[PDB]
Design an enzyme around this catalytic site. Structure first.
Site, PDB file in Angstrom:
ATOM      1  N   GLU A  36     -18.724  -0.679  12.887  1.00 39.12           N
ATOM      2  CA  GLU A  36     -17.381  -0.568  13.079  1.00 39.12           C
ATOM      3  C   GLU A  36     -17.371  -1.272  14.743  1.00 39.12           C
ATOM      4  OE1 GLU A  36     -14.333  -1.472  12.797  1.00 39.12           O
ATOM      5  OE2 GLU A  36     -13.642  -0.078  11.522  1.00 39.12           O
TER       6      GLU A  36
ATOM      7  N   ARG B 156     -20.020   5.510   5.820  1.00 37.58           N
ATOM      8  CA  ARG B 156     -18.728   5.475   4.897  1.00 37.58           C
ATOM      9  C   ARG B 156     -18.592   3.575   4.290  1.00 37.58           C
ATOM     10  NH1 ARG B 156     -16.234   3.782  11.082  1.00 37.58           N
ATOM     11  NH2 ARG B 156     -17.421   5.787  11.202  1.00 37.58           N
TER      12      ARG B 156
ATOM     13  N   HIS C 169     -17.008  -2.773   8.170  1.00 29.61           N
ATOM     14  CA  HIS C 169     -15.565  -2.225   8.253  1.00 29.61           C
ATOM     15  C   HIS C 169     -14.552  -3.426   9.155  1.00 29.61           C
ATOM     16  CE1 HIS C 169     -18.733   1.286   8.683  1.00 29.61           C
ATOM     17  NE2 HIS C 169     -19.382   0.322   9.179  1.00 29.61           N
TER      18      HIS C 169
ATOM     19  N   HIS D  37     -14.554  -1.014   3.818  1.00 29.03           N
ATOM     20  CA  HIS D  37     -14.744   0.331   2.778  1.00 29.03           C
ATOM     21  C   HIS D  37     -13.200   0.506   3.289  1.00 29.03           C
ATOM     22  CE1 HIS D  37     -14.795   2.059   6.483  1.00 29.03           C
ATOM     23  NE2 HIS D  37     -15.190   1.188   7.136  1.00 29.03           N
TER      24      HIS D  37
END
Lengths: 234, 235, 235, 235
Positions: free
Chosen positions: A86, A59, A181, A8
């Site tokens: 992440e 996200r 991520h 992202h």
């Protein structure tokens, strides 16, 4: 088998210079745009995901939703896992990156950001930036949920999901797309390519540019991975 | 249990006055804003979905996506089913609505659009507006996929998914959100409220407004249904 | 696609002359041996199931477990559904077949037993032979669970499960084995072969012998079905 | 949350003094009796599993099937995972245990059998006793599948399944039954009770006697675990 990875674009904190980690920060207007270009690249380059895997972080999820709308594959099944999250930034979650650099000095700051196995200091279970007890993790063994992580650690909790869940689809002939991520994807790439503990520190995955892996039956690269916009990747 | 129904706002085809049905038409700029408003209303009214269910149609999927983002619940599990699809429009798919009314008259037209059980003529498998052989339905028994439908028929194919899949979640204590379409959602409301074959044509479900059903252990309304913006839904 | 059907051998109530239906009666010693023979045939004849579907009744389940133990494929994934259940027998559940004939007479008794669309009288929720509220069905919409059925009805509630769930596996190239009952399997065969509402009462599916269907991309037979022991089946 | 562990009784190889590991050896006749006895204990003691988890090994799968038949709970959902498998014995798989006590001596043999982190030598791919390339593991990443293991390693591949899959059912209030093996269940018990690496070799889990843990919201014993036959388990 074919695997597509999408990192992202910036969250609202990346602009504010705050370490994000597992804090569920929203994609910024610019992050939304990269999400849209990632999808357009998927279409343009004829890469059609049959299934999608995301982390439990908005996200990445929103990047998938946006990217898939532009690729016209919004109907595909979707699975989410905390194992694709992440790297948890521990006490550095919610902290200014410039102040963290002034507080710990350059050596310790590079160690926290990029050592392979030394994780950031652990976060207090009652911090405003702690994900402990968060609803989206309520069905996971409380004990495994991290309070900080290094890349080494990220890879340890991610591989089982890759091994049993993502692998089943790949081995079933499905083109898988993973929207995750920077650290969970660098972790997976370290694994797929046999990148050394020392070398991995230097790997950067460009946000909003689909990374494609053509794998063999042993889930090993049959040829070099390739970005859908090679020129924008380098 | 608690169930929230969200009907998507207009699609690009609605704006252009074309019958959609199973054509995977994109949501319009304004449909996107209504989706957003649906999300703000979820958050605002403290209706927090635990699981999402959509049709296989993009306009409904994108609505859930936008609405869940504003509601900050993008992380929830999602399941998709063709049994939640809009009513298939038959040979009317992709035809101009005003042209259709001039060709059939105010009677046959109103029957095709709002009768309980009179389906439009079936669409030929070779039409550009036919979904026969579409990738997203490839693991479904070919024989059951409609080539035209009426509300009655939408209900017959929808109920089994509601009976086994959606019901398990509801009976497990999870707040279910369904982002679907006009016919499938009216079909579900007809079933839930026990509306007759005759009275259902009256029911209008407004777009971009969550409709909440609190149900008992038999999945029957515990109190009456309510929109999250009662005023805007009543005008 | 390849599909294998296995009908369970006798339950303990068959010998006792009582109507079973949804009552969860255990497989008889002879049922256990036919199960072992069913699995021995799968191996002998090289029919290797990739996934198993069973009803929610013990006799079919145990038949499957016994059969797979003999076939050395105990490890395959298993899915169960009330929709593969035997035809619910209504008030006739747990009643003596001889006394039932005396009570209703030849015509009505044959009706309840073998007509396509006239179900037995419904059973009351209080009867110790009613499955209403039973734990294995607690996650299914209470409104859909039958209090009596006819074969027409069985086929009605079975098809949606075949269409979306079992069909997914067959269309994915998986050899599916179903371990079910007389009514449920006959209902499925009626559907697969296009047997008339009038000739299905005549189809008998032999207990303990696998019936193999090779299906085409439309899940319609590409060659006639065949039992794994053609003689034991046609005797 | 309530968890029930069931260690299978002996296999045909345990009877003949052969190291099993991942070899899919059939349960012995005495092993089938222990299974039945495990089931009578569940029933008798009122421990009602809502879902079953097993390894991909027949001896553990047949144990669950026989036990659940005796418990009248054959209908419960079932999931299988290679992660609940017995410890892979590497080159020791299919070898005589007493012949191994000689070929290594009391202290090297004891290492391969009861040390925490030193695994047996790996088994060659082309050995008759290698599980490399076996159909029941064709959808697992080939790279993670072991060619030998230590208890330390068993625990490492087991924990993720427990953390995400089994935990979800427990945490949703469902009573879970695991039918597995010596090393995988000792491994889970080492984790549940916080037994040190040093003291783990000392733990024994008797075959065919359900071991019940009552857990808290943190999945830690809320009271000492207990067998359903205290005397027989400790004797």
């Amino acid at each position: 088998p074919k695997l597509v990875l999408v990192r992202h674009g910036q969250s609202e904190w990346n602009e504010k210079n705050l370490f994000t980690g597992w804090v569920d920060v929203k994609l910024s207007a610019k992050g939304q745009q990269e999400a849209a270009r990632a999808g357009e690249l998927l279409k343009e380059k004829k890469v059609y995901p049959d299934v999608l895997y995301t982390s439990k972080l908005s996200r990445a999820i929103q990047t998938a939703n946006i990217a898939l709308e532009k690729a016209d594959r919004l109907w595909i099944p979707v699975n989410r896992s905390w194992r694709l999250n992440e790297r948890h930034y521990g006490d550095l979650q919610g902290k200014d990156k410039a102040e963290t650099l002034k507080k710990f000095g350059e050596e310790k700051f590079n160690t926290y950001r990029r050592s392979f196995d030394v994780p950031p200091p652990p976060i207090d279970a009652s911090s405003p930036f702690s994900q402990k007890g968060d609803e989206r993790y309520k069905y996971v063994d409380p004990n495994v949920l991290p309070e900080t992580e290094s890349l080494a650690l990220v890879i340890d909790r991610l591989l089982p999901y890759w091994q049993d869940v993502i692998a089943k689809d790949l081995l079933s002939g499905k083109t898988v797309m993973i929207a995750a991520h920077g650290n969970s994807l660098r972790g997976l790439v370290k694994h797929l390519e046999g990148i050394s503990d020392a070398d991995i520190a230097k790997l950067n995955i460009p946000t909003g540019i689909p990374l494609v892996f053509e794998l063999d039956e042993n889930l090993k690269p049959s040829k070099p991975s390739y970005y859908l916009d090679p020129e924008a990747a380098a």
